[PDB]
Design an enzyme around this catalytic site. Structure first.
Site, PDB file in Angstrom:
ATOM      1  N   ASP A   1       0.789  -1.172   0.024  1.00 31.84           N
ATOM      2  CA  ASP A   1       0.073   0.054   0.033  1.00 31.84           C
ATOM      3  C   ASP A   1       0.788   1.089   0.125  1.00 31.84           C
ATOM      4  O   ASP A   1       1.615   1.610   0.863  1.00 31.84           O
ATOM      5  CB  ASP A   1      -0.806   0.076   1.127  1.00 31.84           C
ATOM      6  CG  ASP A   1      -1.968   1.045   1.223  1.00 31.84           C
ATOM      7  OD1 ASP A   1      -3.050   0.953   0.434  1.00 31.84           O
ATOM      8  OD2 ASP A   1      -1.608   2.254   1.589  1.00 31.84           O
TER       9      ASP A   1
ATOM     10  N   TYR B   1       2.190  10.105  -0.496  1.00 32.43           N
ATOM     11  CA  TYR B   1       3.600   9.398   0.221  1.00 32.43           C
ATOM     12  C   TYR B   1       4.971   9.869  -0.281  1.00 32.43           C
ATOM     13  O   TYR B   1       5.973   9.793   0.144  1.00 32.43           O
ATOM     14  CB  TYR B   1       3.641   7.868   0.688  1.00 32.43           C
ATOM     15  CG  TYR B   1       2.300   7.443   1.161  1.00 32.43           C
ATOM     16  CD1 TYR B   1       1.252   8.242   1.730  1.00 32.43           C
ATOM     17  CD2 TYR B   1       1.929   6.348   1.279  1.00 32.43           C
ATOM     18  CE1 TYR B   1      -0.042   7.974   2.388  1.00 32.43           C
ATOM     19  CE2 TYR B   1       0.894   5.560   1.742  1.00 32.43           C
ATOM     20  CZ  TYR B   1      -0.234   6.568   2.264  1.00 32.43           C
ATOM     21  OH  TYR B   1      -1.379   6.276   2.835  1.00 32.43           O
TER      22      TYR B   1
ATOM     23  N   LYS C   1      -3.046   5.728  -4.697  1.00 33.22           N
ATOM     24  CA  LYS C   1      -4.120   6.634  -4.152  1.00 33.22           C
ATOM     25  C   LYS C   1      -4.154   7.793  -4.921  1.00 33.22           C
ATOM     26  O   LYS C   1      -2.907   8.206  -5.189  1.00 33.22           O
ATOM     27  CB  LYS C   1      -4.084   6.921  -2.787  1.00 33.22           C
ATOM     28  CG  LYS C   1      -4.091   5.392  -1.902  1.00 33.22           C
ATOM     29  CD  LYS C   1      -4.324   5.944  -0.529  1.00 33.22           C
ATOM     30  CE  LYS C   1      -3.937   4.899   0.321  1.00 33.22           C
ATOM     31  NZ  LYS C   1      -2.408   4.796   0.822  1.00 33.22           N
TER      32      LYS C   1
ATOM     33  N   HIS D   1      -8.354   8.949  -2.154  1.00 30.19           N
ATOM     34  CA  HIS D   1      -7.665   9.084  -0.964  1.00 30.19           C
ATOM     35  C   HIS D   1      -8.370   9.760   0.171  1.00 30.19           C
ATOM     36  O   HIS D   1      -8.294   9.283   1.300  1.00 30.19           O
ATOM     37  CB  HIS D   1      -6.322   9.724  -1.242  1.00 30.19           C
ATOM     38  CG  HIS D   1      -5.020   9.253  -0.063  1.00 30.19           C
ATOM     39  ND1 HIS D   1      -3.561   9.523  -0.364  1.00 30.19           N
ATOM     40  CD2 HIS D   1      -5.385   9.104   1.115  1.00 30.19           C
ATOM     41  CE1 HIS D   1      -3.273   9.197   0.708  1.00 30.19           C
ATOM     42  NE2 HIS D   1      -4.091   9.088   1.393  1.00 30.19           N
TER      43      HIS D   1
HETATM   44  N1  NAP Z   1      -5.869   5.989   3.601  1.00 31.08           N
HETATM   45  C1  NAP Z   1      -5.415   6.742   4.522  1.00 31.08           C
HETATM   46  O1  NAP Z   1      -5.960   8.167   4.630  1.00 31.08           O
HETATM   47  C2  NAP Z   1      -4.164   6.559   5.171  1.00 31.08           C
HETATM   48  C3  NAP Z   1      -3.984   7.367   6.303  1.00 31.08           C
HETATM   49  C4  NAP Z   1      -2.659   6.624   7.102  1.00 31.08           C
HETATM   50  C5  NAP Z   1      -2.159   5.595   6.738  1.00 31.08           C
HETATM   51  N2  NAP Z   1      -2.573   4.749   5.416  1.00 31.08           N
HETATM   52  C6  NAP Z   1      -1.997   3.537   5.251  1.00 31.08           C
HETATM   53  O2  NAP Z   1      -2.039   2.668   6.316  1.00 31.08           O
HETATM   54  C7  NAP Z   1      -0.758   1.949   6.400  1.00 31.08           C
HETATM   55  C8  NAP Z   1      -0.725   1.555   7.983  1.00 31.08           C
HETATM   56  O3  NAP Z   1      -0.977   2.669   8.799  1.00 31.08           O
HETATM   57  P1  NAP Z   1       0.123   3.494   9.628  1.00 31.08           P
HETATM   58  O4  NAP Z   1       1.499   3.370   8.842  1.00 31.08           O
HETATM   59  O5  NAP Z   1      -0.591   5.072   9.643  1.00 31.08           O
HETATM   60  O6  NAP Z   1       0.282   3.125  10.935  1.00 31.08           O
HETATM   61  P2  NAP Z   1       0.170   1.587  11.574  1.00 31.08           P
HETATM   62  O7  NAP Z   1       0.605   0.487  10.901  1.00 31.08           O
HETATM   63  O8  NAP Z   1      -0.949   1.357  12.613  1.00 31.08           O
HETATM   64  O9  NAP Z   1       1.494   1.658  12.949  1.00 31.08           O
HETATM   65  C9  NAP Z   1       2.824   2.029  12.498  1.00 31.08           C
HETATM   66  C10 NAP Z   1       3.881   1.889  14.046  1.00 31.08           C
HETATM   67  O10 NAP Z   1       3.633   0.403  14.324  1.00 31.08           O
HETATM   68  C11 NAP Z   1       5.076  -0.022  14.534  1.00 31.08           C
HETATM   69  N3  NAP Z   1       5.317  -1.211  14.556  1.00 31.08           N
HETATM   70  C12 NAP Z   1       4.976  -2.083  13.311  1.00 31.08           C
HETATM   71  N4  NAP Z   1       4.911  -3.407  13.788  1.00 31.08           N
HETATM   72  C13 NAP Z   1       5.186  -3.359  14.903  1.00 31.08           C
HETATM   73  C14 NAP Z   1       5.176  -4.485  15.993  1.00 31.08           C
HETATM   74  N5  NAP Z   1       5.058  -5.700  15.398  1.00 31.08           N
HETATM   75  N6  NAP Z   1       5.403  -4.341  17.273  1.00 31.08           N
HETATM   76  C15 NAP Z   1       5.645  -2.833  17.824  1.00 31.08           C
HETATM   77  N7  NAP Z   1       5.324  -1.962  16.669  1.00 31.08           N
HETATM   78  C16 NAP Z   1       5.345  -2.025  15.542  1.00 31.08           C
HETATM   79  C17 NAP Z   1       5.940   0.880  13.506  1.00 31.08           C
HETATM   80  O11 NAP Z   1       7.241   0.921  14.037  1.00 31.08           O
HETATM   81  P3  NAP Z   1       8.379   0.927  12.963  1.00 31.08           P
HETATM   82  O12 NAP Z   1       8.310   1.225  11.615  1.00 31.08           O
HETATM   83  O13 NAP Z   1       9.490   1.900  13.326  1.00 31.08           O
HETATM   84  O14 NAP Z   1       8.740  -0.750  13.023  1.00 31.08           O
HETATM   85  C18 NAP Z   1       5.192   2.329  13.330  1.00 31.08           C
HETATM   86  O15 NAP Z   1       5.583   3.146  14.189  1.00 31.08           O
HETATM   87  C19 NAP Z   1       0.217   3.177   6.180  1.00 31.08           C
HETATM   88  O16 NAP Z   1       1.558   2.822   6.155  1.00 31.08           O
HETATM   89  C20 NAP Z   1      -0.586   3.486   4.745  1.00 31.08           C
HETATM   90  O17 NAP Z   1      -0.094   2.640   3.840  1.00 31.08           O
HETATM   91  C21 NAP Z   1      -3.788   5.380   4.855  1.00 31.08           C
END
Ligand code: NAP
Length: 284
Positions: free
Chosen positions: A44, A49, A78, A111
């Site tokens: 994704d 980004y 997106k 998006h």
């Molecule tokens: N559609 C939208 O409006 C929108 C908005 C936001 C995000 N997104 C998408 O959603 C994806 C996922 O969401 P996100 O990046 O916002 O947040 P997330 O995946 O909920 O959490 C990210 C955090 O969790 C940590 N982490 C990952 N695995 C872990 C584990 N097993 N144990 C402890 N910590 C862990 C990571 O640290 P490290 O990286 O340093 O390991 C990072 O700081 C994004 O990358 C993006 O592709 C979409």
């Protein structure tokens, strides 16, 4: 053995994927390449980004080195707010396509729910029918907004990507989507670590029970609901941890315990907050 969901048009999408938000453009190639090596297929990204170009390079290597074929991958990107329109949307897609160095995209999303999303969807339907994209969908759409599209256009959105995690679980919207054949996809499945989520006592008691981590439990919980989840990590060891969740199952009791944690609102902000609409529309 990562399960797949079947979308409303028969396209199969992996239920667990790899997100690249806040991975710097210059670190994104190595991250995605490692993820793919570990076994991710759902990737994704987004125009916003600024790391599509790195995503594409990782893929190109994996393919050239024989690790995967293109059809095994599921690439999501997106359309950003500032590109929303009719021709502007085609142009944006074609820009992302180029950056990614791909012939087609598996899933393309609107998006944000702002601007002329009716023209964007119409554009997207036409690229869909031309064969340029396997599935088209939206992100951050409340049910009223989903309905508005559905009653004005032919193609039901295949996916709606929204914030879903133990503190914003959004069950009523899930059942609306299931009713209308829109696959829910969880962004921020860990709430980006907000609210000491990895240390939550309820989650740890369930994790202890199975000799798993809290992160694993959260992702098992989502996927057990039939929700696609796209956790992000820059660490090889967490990629491995986050995908290694299908060798166990939560009981009904476990699922009910987790349900008690819902706070019923975003960990970040509301898309119905007019100040938020403006802040988002002024980013670019
Ligand atoms: N559609 C939208 O409006 C929108 C908005 C936001 C995000 N997104 C998408 O959603 C994806 C996922 O969401 P996100 O990046 O916002 O947040 P997330 O995946 O909920 O959490 C990210 C955090 O969790 C940590 N982490 C990952 N695995 C872990 C584990 N097993 N144990 C402890 N910590 C862990 C990571 O640290 P490290 O990286 O340093 O390991 C990072 O700081 C994004 O990358 C993006 O592709 C979409």
């Amino acid at each position: 053995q990562v399960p797949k969901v079947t979308l409303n048009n028969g396209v199969e999408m992996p239920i667990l994927g790899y997100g690249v938000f806040q991975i710097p453009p210059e670190k994104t190639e190595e991250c995605v390449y490692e993820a793919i090596k570990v076994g991710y297929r759902l990737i994704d990204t987004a125009a916003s980004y600024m790391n599509e170009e790195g995503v594409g390079r990782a893929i190109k290597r994996a393919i050239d080195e024989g690790i995967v074929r293109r059809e095994e991958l599921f690439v999501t990107t997106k359309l950003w707010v500032s590109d929303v329109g009719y021709e502007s949307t085609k142009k944006a897609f074609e820009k992302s396509l180029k950056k990614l160095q791909l012939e087609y995209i598996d899933l393309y999303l609107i998006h944000q729910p702002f601007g002329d999303v009716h023209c964007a969807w119409k554009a997207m339907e036409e690229m869909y029918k031309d064969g340029l994209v396997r599935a088209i969908g939206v992100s951050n759409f409340y049910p009223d907004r989903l309905m508005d599209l559905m009653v004005h256009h032919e193609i039901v959105p295949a996916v709606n990507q929204i914030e879903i995690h133990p503190f914003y679980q959004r069950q009523e919207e899930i059942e609306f989507m299931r009713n209308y054949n829109i696959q829910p996809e969880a962004w921020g499945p860990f709430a980006e670590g907000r609210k000491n989520i990895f240390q939550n006592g309820v989650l740890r008691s369930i994790a202890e029970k199975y000799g798993k981590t809290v992160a694993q439990v959260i992702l098992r919980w989502l996927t057990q609901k039939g929700i696609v989840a796209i956790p992000k990590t820059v660490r090889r060891e967490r990629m491995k941890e986050n995908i290694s969740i299908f060798d166990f199952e939560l009981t009904q009791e476990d699922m009910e315990k987790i349900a008690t944690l819902d706070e019923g609102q975003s960990a970040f902000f509301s898309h119905r907050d007019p100040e938020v609409v403006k802040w988002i529309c002024s980013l670019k």
